Design a protein around this ligand. Structure first.
Ligand SMILES: Nc1ncnc2c1ncn2[C@@H]1O[C@H](COP(=O)(O)OP(=O)(O)OP(O)(O)=S)[C@@H](O)[C@H]1O
Ligand SMILES: Nc1ncnc2c1ncn2[C@@H]1O[C@H](COP(=O)(O)OP(=O)(O)OP(O)(O)=S)[C@@H](O)[C@H]1O
Ligand SMILES: Nc1ncnc2c1ncn2[C@@H]1O[C@H](COP(=O)(O)OP(=O)(O)OP(O)(O)=S)[C@@H](O)[C@H]1O
Ligand SMILES: Nc1ncnc2c1ncn2[C@@H]1O[C@H](COP(=O)(O)OP(=O)(O)OP(O)(O)=S)[C@@H](O)[C@H]1O
Ligand SMILES: Nc1ncnc2c1ncn2[C@@H]1O[C@H](COP(=O)(O)OP(=O)(O)OP(O)(O)=S)[C@@H](O)[C@H]1O
Ligand SMILES: Nc1ncnc2c1ncn2[C@@H]1O[C@H](COP(=O)(O)OP(=O)(O)OP(O)(O)=S)[C@@H](O)[C@H]1O
Ligand SMILES: [Cl-]
Ligand SMILES: [Cl-]
Ligand SMILES: [Cl-]
Ligand SMILES: [Cl-]
Ligand SMILES: [Cl-]
Ligand SMILES: [Cl-]
Ligand SMILES: [Mg+2]
Ligand SMILES: [Mg+2]
Ligand SMILES: [Mg+2]
Ligand SMILES: [Mg+2]
Ligand SMILES: [Mg+2]
Ligand SMILES: [Mg+2]
Lengths: 223, 225, 226, 227, 219, 228
């Protein structure tokens, strides 16, 4: 539908652009939260990968724990050659894994250098465990700075319960424009993966949980 | 004199539930989890005052920028920038302990300058979170409510909560120092979401009880029979 | 020399449940979540005492202003300003400008002597308590004992955050009080149901469990169970 | 098979549930939420001792005044003031006038026990003093030494404690039951808007007792327990 | 393959497939009045009466006098055994290593093979400290070659095995005594949660406490 | 190269559930409440490596003494003493003298690895030194460094940790699963008055696996898992 207020870019992730009514809001950050092994990193990568392959939009991936080499190695599970894209200057993996102000400028520099339209930030809450009010302000500053740059950003966060707080510090969903929840629910000894778009400021979207699978082709969502 | 009188919100179904609207000269707490429609409720309250009654409004925002408020309001067919240019709406940027005492006098300037009868305060929780102490939150919120009452503004103020059926708000005190409490819920059941609105209390006047289903549409909040 | 006597509240249904009303000379805790009717109960207690028995009352407010108290009471067709003007009611403002327990108690005593009040309602003492469970326990204990010396029959409101959880905020209030009333506002299947319970009345009898009630244009009405 | 001796409470039903009454020369913890009948159990225990057996009793109170104890007991037609005048009952007042010392309190209790030649003791409100210790470890050791001292005097003691949940911890600090020889739990269970009073003997060291909850009522005659 | 010693507690040796592993520590955890002390006592008493294996009982809160008096209700004369030198009740009711040394001395002096440690949880006021202290105690008893029953407390029937959430991880063997409320009735059950290096029956088995001690029915 | 390759555990049913075994050169976290079979899984991993593929193994123990490990494995008919005597299995006692330095341990581990030419490593009881810290942030960082150091040596590692609830957090500090590449959960669930053991592979980074819980028993031949 054209009659929505916020311009969106397509993830080209199957089923997600339907649920989000067109993709992710351009120039804004989308929180992607979930328990362990829910597919947060995969979503973040597939966002960048599809952007490059489909639209030749350069991407910057910021990682806080997983090494660039593990990211590249793990992506081969889906037939994606990220090293080749890194070689072409179409993908840049920014290694922030051994101050958030200095980091923001590193990202800013990479975005300008590589002319990136899409940004994924994976594992930023590992920097918080280092108070909810402090988390809230720092995230708020990061989101605002990314917006001023004009980046369209996916940022992952962690949660420890399938049905409970959106993320660890109970403030993350409130300073984000957009919130996506990945679940991996255990019921009667079986797991089922779901994705929910909890909110998208300024636009409609499908509500509730929608089933998805992770396969050799990445994330497949069925709305 | 009379029992407290009410101001019509013109939000479909709400004036029915509230038996006339929001109590005049007082603040109404509107609490909910993330993306429940709190900002929308606050905006629609002001927007309807301007369009339907030519009552000017002041919107106070703590985190969301004025430009984003305006842009997001276009989703509901509302041209806030036009209202700002006509001087019928003023958006006060409260983004950066935080001095709520200094803030309220800036709000007063705007109220007097634009002759506002309706005020919406969105995101005061972000300030309360610095406090991170129930006793301080209670005291500061009490003073804020008291100062607003002195001005005579009819006010909607939003707050956050983290559970659909737990505490009214974050610090377990907000509902006790508010005259009026509205709870917006976004309940997940069987993988589907169901939005509801409840008027928990209105001091000194009557209202319908329990939860009432609503949806958010291209025309804003729509509360069902 | 004999069993504790009771003072009638004239609150529709309560004197039945309480088997005569509130125990004379003692304080009754009325606890509830937000908007359960705690202030209304406290006010109706004084209002009925004035109107039915010509017993003067003192209302102590810690947050809500006297003006608001009066304004909100007009919802029930009650003219509190009149009762204040006639010297039958005093609203004692202990609320802060937009804590000394001893100073407050002497003000209450002064007011009780000045207006010859037999009934007292204290609304919002919780707000000063939040400024340690055992500090709260000791302060509350002292307030109760002091009111007892004066001979006041007192309604005292407190807050709770769950319908089926602790009686009040600090887990000690009910153990210090002689009498405990719980107001509930239970949400079940998107519908709210108000109930009143007399949990405890020291040295006397009372009906048990929850009894449904409503708040109407003329105050609290309590009905038979179920 | 040498049995632990017991003394009868004469509280209707209880001596059946306890198989003879309360273990002699030991302390029995009586825990419950608000208005569960803890003080009533404490008083009825002393009152029956005096009336039925001519055994003097000492009631130790920490919050409720002797005058209120006496006043409230008239609800059941008991004249405690008369018993105090006869020296059959002594209400020891430890209530505050508007870190306390145990050793002072116990020597008071000890003196009162010796003076009135009391065989039964009820201690009511000791939780109030364990509440700004407000530390489980501290409460445990202080309560332990209190029990040990009472045992030396040879007093058979009922001591009340508080709990804030019907089916949660035995008492406030999760330690009180572990340092008591005997534990009784009074419950006031709310189910479907109705209340149900129950008494349970959770444990009696070294002796037998009936298990689980038994319904009781409080009437003009005090506590009446049913099977 | 692992040698076990018989508790001779009715039904228990069946549940443990032959008794408690010799030279190992067994945690016996439960809420108040679940039969922890009774289990500890029977373990030593049976070892003495039937196998002439001396025992040491270590008590932290309950006095030796009360332990003796309470055991008498089961017809067990512990005073005779302590006077015969077959049993030693170590009053640890006045520094864990000072305790350890006293235990060791008693074991050596009385040539004890069974040890019951009852109420060690009262020593603690930090889970890491508790874990470290308990591990040292267990390790030392193992080096001595003692077979040990060690009681601990819990506050809920279903939840943490013991108070500090570490006790079950430092013990070789874990036994849980439950006293579960089912519609106003109590039901006693015993469960062996783990026995390192050997098999055992799984889950809960009902028992009663009678004039002859613990009576477990594994059927 | 391509997708991450896997090393066969030869544990009955597990290689089916993991679609080929444990990811080579990486650590797999194995979490469970008390007596769930974590040490057994760790031992059986090394034992099968030695017997089936002649791949030497190193077992790092933080609590159980080496002799207890050997003695406890005898109920499964595994002669671990012989394997130690042959130099095929090295048990590394990492218990502190009856707070901890990871880099010192990695050296001892690395040395043992080179010396015994070990393909497989099991680390059992590292949670005990994590409690010394009692801070999720500290635990998270320390574990992260352990995983990275182990990766640098190229060891395929089983790493046990603890939890106190069958259906609560994966491990103690709520961070362990997030810095691990691979996560296995052993459960021991009450069914009426009976117990039911289950194994779940929660995640394996960069590769596939079966989902949910699968029942297993512990017998005289160790762990036997039942898919289908
Ligand atoms: N080829 C594949 N086929 C099927 N499932 C796969 C495949 N490759 C990976 N997966 C799944 O994808 C998961 C990894 O997803 P991730 O995106 O790394 O999750 P994550 O939320 O980032 O978890 P973390 O970062 O480790 S907490 C694995 O646990 C597998 O379940
Ligand atoms: N045109 C529309 N049609 C339907 N739903 C819409 C439309 N526009 C917005 N929404 C919904 O409105 C939500 C946002 O409403 P808000 O009032 O901003 O909620 P909120 O409680 O203020 O959330 P915060 O401040 O981000 S925590 C979005 O998440 C959408 O679900
Ligand atoms: N005329 C009326 N008819 C029906 N209900 C009314 C009327 N006037 C007020 N009420 C109700 O009474 C409630 C207020 O009762 P209060 O006694 O003020 O409760 P409260 O427990 O003191 O709440 P606090 O102090 O604000 S937390 C309102 O929320 C209404 O639901
Ligand atoms: N004559 C009576 N008939 C029936 N019930 C009575 C009578 N007298 C008192 N009661 C009940 O007994 C209760 C008081 O029992 P108590 O022994 O004081 O309880 P409690 O556990 O000591 O409460 P505390 O100390 O205030 S927390 C009252 O709440 C009544 O429900
Ligand atoms: N002769 C007996 N006949 C029947 N049951 C008995 C007998 N003696 C004791 N009991 C029961 O056994 C319980 C005491 O068992 P213990 O082993 O002392 O419990 P415990 O777990 O050690 O509790 P603690 O140490 O007080 S927390 C009593 O509460 C009775 O229920
Ligand atoms: N021969 C056997 N037959 C059946 N079950 C056995 C046998 N040998 C051991 N077991 C079981 O294996 C369990 C021990 O498994 P472990 O791997 O040691 O568990 P664990 O998770 O390491 O527990 P910890 O470290 O003590 S908390 C015992 O509790 C028994 O239930
Ligand atoms: Cl999947
Ligand atoms: Cl909607
Ligand atoms: Cl009503
Ligand atoms: Cl009753
Ligand atoms: Cl039994
Ligand atoms: Cl098994
Ligand atoms: Mg990831
Ligand atoms: Mg908003
Ligand atoms: Mg009120
Ligand atoms: Mg009492
Ligand atoms: Mg014991
Ligand atoms: Mg192990």
């Amino acid at each position: 539908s054209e009659h929505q207020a916020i311009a969106k870019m397509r993830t080209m992730i199957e089923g997600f652009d339907d649920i989000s009514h067109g993709g992710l809001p351009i120039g804004r950050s989308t929180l992607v939260s979930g328990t362990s092994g829910t597919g947060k990193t995969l979503f973040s990568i597939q966002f960048l990968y599809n952007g490059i392959i489909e639209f030749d939009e350069p991407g910057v991936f910021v990682t806080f724990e997983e090494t660039p080499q593990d990211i590249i190695k793990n992506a081969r599970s889906f037939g994606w050659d990220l090293a080749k894209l890194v070689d072409e200057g179409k993908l840049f993996i920014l290694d922030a894994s051994p101050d958030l102000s200095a980091l923001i400028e590193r990202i800013n520099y990479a975005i300008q250098k590589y002319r990136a339209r899409r940004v994924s930030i994976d594992g930023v809450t590992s920097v918080f465990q280092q108070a909810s009010s402090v988390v809230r302000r720092e995230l708020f500053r990061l989101v605002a700075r990314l917006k001023q740059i004009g980046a369209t950003t996916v940022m992952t966060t962690e949660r420890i319960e399938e049905y409970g707080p959106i993320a660890r510090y109970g403030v993350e969903e409130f300073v984000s424009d957009n919130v996506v929840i990945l679940r991996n629910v255990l019921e009667g000894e079986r797991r089922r993966r779901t994705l929910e778009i909890l909110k998208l400021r300024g636009t409609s979207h499908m509500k509730g949980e929608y089933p998805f699978t992770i396969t050799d082709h990445g994330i497949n969502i069925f709305p």
